[PDB]
Structure formats: structure tokens, C-alpha cells
């Protein structure tokens, strides 16, 4: 049951820094037992996505909640640096997070940033048009959605070569 993928469940997992407005109870997978069916209004928490995927963006059991990469400052200067914002692997996938997370902001900015980032791939792979040589070239500034088309375009050229004569 998903927008399916071999990456079918890199989907509902990204952990957060979620705060608290009100009380909580019985944290379960945290250090919790028969110890706290009560906690404070105001505590930062790391949390998965699955149970909170369906927990009431309007309601406040939990609160305004972002990760810090996902905080707007670098993301803002990267809609001004939507030209060479460099990635690596500290945030390997950076492309469809908002493709869930956008409405939980309460500030209405996320998607514009992201779309601009990938309009840059509408400009980027101008340079990517060939497989020139041996094994590997540039294989760590990559989300694993660009990995797919990257390999794919490589293959396209790879077999275009065998076309190029009897080869």
C-alpha cells in the first residue's frame, strides 16, 4: 500500500525534533513503561513519521515541528543558492520530503523551495550526457531518486554506443 518502490518504506521513517504543547502519556518505544502517563507541555522529541502521518495537522497533541536541515534558513538561502547548494550524504534524500511534510509547517514555504531546487535539474544535467570511461564518477551528492535516472541516462548512452556502428 504505497506510491510503491523498492524504496517502499524510506517513506514513513525520517526522525524529527518534535516539540510538545500539552501533556503526553506512556511513550512506549522511548524509555517508557508503567512510568509516565503524563509529561510536560514543552519538550523536544525525536519521532518517526508513521503514527504521526495521520495525527491532525490542525490539532496540537504535538506542535510546530521541523528538523533543522528542514528549518528555513539554509533552505531560504538555497532558493537564493538554488545554484550550488551542495548535498553529499548528511541529507542524502532531499527531494520529496515535503511530498509529505509540507502542511505541518504552519509557515507556507516548503514546496516552493523544493520545486526550485529541482528546476535546477531541469538546468543541471546539461553536462550529464555520456559515459566516458571506467567505473564511477560523482556518486555521492545523490538522493536515490536522481540515482535512478542517472544510471538510466548512462545506460541510454551505453547502448546508443553499440548502435553507433555494428558495435
Amino acid at each position: 500500500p504505497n506510491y510503491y518502490s523498492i524504496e517502499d518504506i524510506f517513506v514513513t521513517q525520517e526522525k524529527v525534533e518534535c516539540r510538545v504543547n500539552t501533556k503526553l502519556q506512556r511513550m512506549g518505544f522511548l524509555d517508557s513503561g508503567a512510568e509516565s502517563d503524563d509529561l510536560e507541555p514543552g519538550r523536544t522529541v525525536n519521532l518517526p513519521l508513521w503514527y504521526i502521518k495521520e495525527l491532525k495537522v490542525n490539532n496540537a497533541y504535538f506542535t510546530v515541528a521541523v528538523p533543522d536541515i528542514y528549518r528555513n534558513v539554509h533552505k531560504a538561502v538555497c532558493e537564493a543558492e538554488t545554484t550550488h547548494i551542495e548535498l553529499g550524504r548528511l541529507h542524502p534524500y532531499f527531494y520529496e520530503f515535503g511530498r509529505y511534510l509540507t502542511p505541518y509547517d504552519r509557515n507556507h514555504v516548503i514546496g516552493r523551495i523544493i520545486f526550485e531546487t529541482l528546476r535546477q535539474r531541469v538546468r543541471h544535467l546539461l553536462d550529464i550526457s555520456k559515459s566516458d570511461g571506467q567505473a564511477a564518477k560523482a556518486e555521492h551528492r545523490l538522493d536515490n531518486i536522481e540515482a535512478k535516472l542517472h544510471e538510466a541516462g548512462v545506460r541510454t548512452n551505453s547502448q546508443y554506443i553499440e548502435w553507433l556502428q555494428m558495435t
Binding site: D127, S129, K130, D132, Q134, A135, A136, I161, Q165, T167
Partner: protein, 620 residues
Amino acid sequence: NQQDAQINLQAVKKKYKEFIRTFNEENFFYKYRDTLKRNYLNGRYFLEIEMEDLVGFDETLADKLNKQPTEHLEIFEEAAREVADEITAPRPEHEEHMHDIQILLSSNANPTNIRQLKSDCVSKLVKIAGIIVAASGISAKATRMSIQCLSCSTVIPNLYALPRKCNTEQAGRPKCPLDPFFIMPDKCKCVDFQTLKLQELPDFVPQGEIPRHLQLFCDRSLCERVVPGNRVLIQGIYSIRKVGKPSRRDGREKAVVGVRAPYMRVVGITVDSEGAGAISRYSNITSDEEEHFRRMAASGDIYERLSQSLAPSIFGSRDIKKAITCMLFGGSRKRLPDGLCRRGDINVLLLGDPGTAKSQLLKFVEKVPIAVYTSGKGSSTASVMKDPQTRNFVMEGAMVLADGGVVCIDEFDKMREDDRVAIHEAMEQQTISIAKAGITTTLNSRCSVLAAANSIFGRWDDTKGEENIDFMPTILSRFDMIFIVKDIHDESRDITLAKHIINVHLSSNKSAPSEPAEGEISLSTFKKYIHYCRTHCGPRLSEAAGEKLKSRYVLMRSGAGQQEKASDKRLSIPITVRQLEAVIRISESLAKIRLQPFATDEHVNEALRLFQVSTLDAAM
């Protein structure tokens, strides 16, 4: 432009220009257009070429190319940019601006020797093979620029005279003579310049002499190309920088007639393939290679095959050798957010009766990516010199040349202690410190070391008790696996050693029937294999390994203390944190070999039995 021969135009006119458009085989690969364009795409701005294509094309250029290459190899550049800028046009709209490029040359003709690089061999293309020592930093150079006085990009043939007239003459009759040149480096250019270096070979007239060497030059893309201590194949050119014979005799009492200086510039360095001559930093290796690698890693009969790689003429010492190579791979530099960068590399001891092939073995461990060997009386205080140009205090600082490599030495015993202490220390923290003159540059580098030695009194000390070292137990501390060498008698052993080496020592014997053994082959492969396997995997333990290893070290210290008590006096080696802190690196070396990240305690029972040699050695 005197269109008779040697003309500026004929070459560029069509010949070089069309050589590549014309360079053809079906399969429609066989040009240099594809390589050029696909190089351009990724900012390369070069391409690779042969020198025996002209025979594929013609019979004239080459015997003209050797003569005045300095010009031909820039006509090449111009033809290159004009033949490539047409393709820079997808339509006329995406050459935002052109760009400059560098050509390469290569061949397989033959390497020469420095002893012959002579006045005939000058301004002339060549091939050699030497070795590298060190070379400069990365300064600067450019090609042209403008001047406000004339406002023209000053165009030059040579890579200075600046004549008289003003060119701000439109001042009336009040002109500005006597060279008023204001260089406008808003309008200048910039290429690279690095001054590579070259030592001669180890077999080609160093015999009753010493080896000379040579200094070099580069322009654009051969910086960041060569790290020193490497074996090169080269195409360069032998030319000068200054000029003059007549009685303008140089200096104060210099130059009887005309002596000007040597050097070479590179037109197309390449590298060596002494098996894997040049496999140290870059990767021209291909998917077949890596399949080979991992499928041998997939092979579960690789380590015992590798126990037989250094001894194809040597007998015995197999329990001794189950970790003589595990030293090479290194474990893990498992650093942490606090200081505790727990020790990465690995160190070994060995000492015992001579006649047991320590020297040749360490020569081979040098042979098999990066390493050095001296031994005693003297690689590396570290070196604070004072620059004879300008008299500044630079730091050559030579364990720096093991910044990932390893070291081997004997002759720790046979050199005094004024020089042991900086190296006593480096190999616990890997940070070469400095505090001497006006600098506090705590340098660092990841080297290991191998330690051979010689005990005075031999096996006498080894029969009875405590005369093991002559110097100290604080370097009995730093090493994990420590090995006696005896030559205890047995006639079977005697005869077998007898014929074993004679069958070696007869007629340069084993060419054909040597490699027919199983898989014990190609130290070249090991250069490549090592420089791979260390460069990827960063393993660390599995849970089930930790408790048994912990309890084992517990019982180790308890047995050492009991031998202390079973003799009523200290009978032990110090049960250190270093011993576990190193056996961890033995596990790490094993997992580095098979490439499985998470290592189990059966993987390391082998480690247990190998350092057990050290335990039962210092058991008495």
C-alpha cells in the same frame, strides 16, 4: 606568412584540423572528438593522444614534430579549440565564451637515462623513467594582459622588452617617454605552475658514484597530478632559460664562456606499471578489476593462499606469517567527538637469532603501496631549515611520507636514544608536534612501523629469564604481536632447508614452475587490492565478539598475575589497555580483508591464537 614550408598556416589550415574529423573506424568510436567533448562536459579541458598515429596518417609531420615541437604543439591547441568550438555551438547560442585547452602525448617507444640527456638531446622530445623526491607548491603564471598605457592585451610567443614610446602621447607635445607601463591585471590571465622534480634510477650509473636528478615545470593540469616518491614514465623536452656565448662573462668569476642552466618541461607525463607501478592515489581501474577483487573476496580460500605470497622461496614461519600481512591493511580510525581517536594503524615486533631472513623479509614488505626503509644511525627532531632564498624558516619536517603507508625497521637496538623519543611518541597519537622556532604546527600522519631487533646474548636470554631487551619496557608496551626467532636444530628441517633453497638458488631457477602454484600471485595485485580495501570499509565489532574477547583479556591478565604469584614475583608482561586496543585492530584487519563489515569472534579466534604467540613468548 611565407607559404613555402614551415608555414604558420598549412598545418592548422586543414591538416591538424581535419585529422580528427577524419580519424575513423567503424564501431563509430575511433575519434578524439567524443573524448574531447565528453571531457569538456566535465570541466577537464584536455585529451589523450598517441605519437604513432602519424604513421597511421602520413610520413612527414613526426620527423618535423620532433624538430620544432614548441610550435606544433600550440598549433595543435589552436586547431583543437576551433575544431571544438563549432561543436560548442548546439546552435550559435551556447558558446557563452570559448576556453583554453591542453593536449597530451604518449608512446611506448623506450625509456632513456639521465646520463645521456645532453646538448644533442635538447629542445627535443624524449622518454625516460625515474623517481620522485619532492616538488614545489602552486605559484602562478599567465599568458597575456593589458596595460593602461596602451590598452592592448600584450601578446607573447614565449612561455619582456617593453619599448620606449609612450602611447599616452595624445597629451599635446607633452608626452610621457621612458617606459611608463602600468600593468593592468584586471586584464591579465592565470595558469598554473608547479615545478615537478626527478631523480634517476637505482641501477643506471649510481655504481661508483651518486645519482643526480632534475627539476621540472608545468602549466595547467599536471599540478594535482604527482605526489612524490613515485615511479614515472615521461615524455618531456630538454630546454634552457637563459642564453649567451661572447665575452659578457657572467657574474663575478663565473662562466668562462657560456654556461646556461638545464631543466625540462612536461609535454605528457604519464606513469608506471611496475605491476601496479603508479596505483597509489587515482583510479583508472575498471569494473572488471573490482569484480575480480570482490570475487576473490568472495573466495573463501584467499587468506591461506596469502600466507604463501611472501615466501615463494622461503620455508617455514607460517604461524609466524598468519598476520605478517594483516599489518598492511590497517583497521579503523574510529574517532569520536571528544579527543579519543583510538589508535588506527598497527605495529609489530620481532627479534631473534640471525640467519633467519629478517632483512630480505622487510625488503619484500617494502616491495609489496607506499613505504620506506632505513635502519638505525638515522626516515626521520623534525626539520626546521632556513630557506637560502630570502632566509625564511620553512619546515621540510619523513614519517610524513608514511601518511597512510607503513614503516619497517630493524636497528632499533643499534641506534642511540637521542633519537627515539619523538617516535616513541608519534606512534601513540599520530601528531608530529613542533614548538622549536616561531611555529606551533602540530603536524600529523598515520604511519605504522615494523620492528626487528637483535638481542645481545641470543637464545641464552631466551632460555632463562629477564634479559629480553637491552633498552626499555615502554616500547615493549606499544606493540601487539612480538616474535622470538630461534634456529633450533633438526636434521629433517636441516635437509629440507638444504634442498629448498638450492632448488631456488640454481640457474635463476623458478621461472616456469613457480607461479603454477595455487593463487599466490602478483604482488602488483596486492598493491591494488590493498589500496582498494583500506580505502572503503570502516568496520567495527559485533556484539558476540566483545564479551568473549573481554573475558579472554581478563583471563590473560589473571594468568600473568598468577605467574607473578606462581613464582612469588612479577612474572608477566603488563596487561595493558593497549593489548585489547590492538587486538581490536587485528579483528579490523581480518574484516578488512574479507570485506564483511561486522566481524564475529570465530573470525578472531585466529587473532587469539596469533597474539598467543606473544603471550607464550613472554610467559617464560
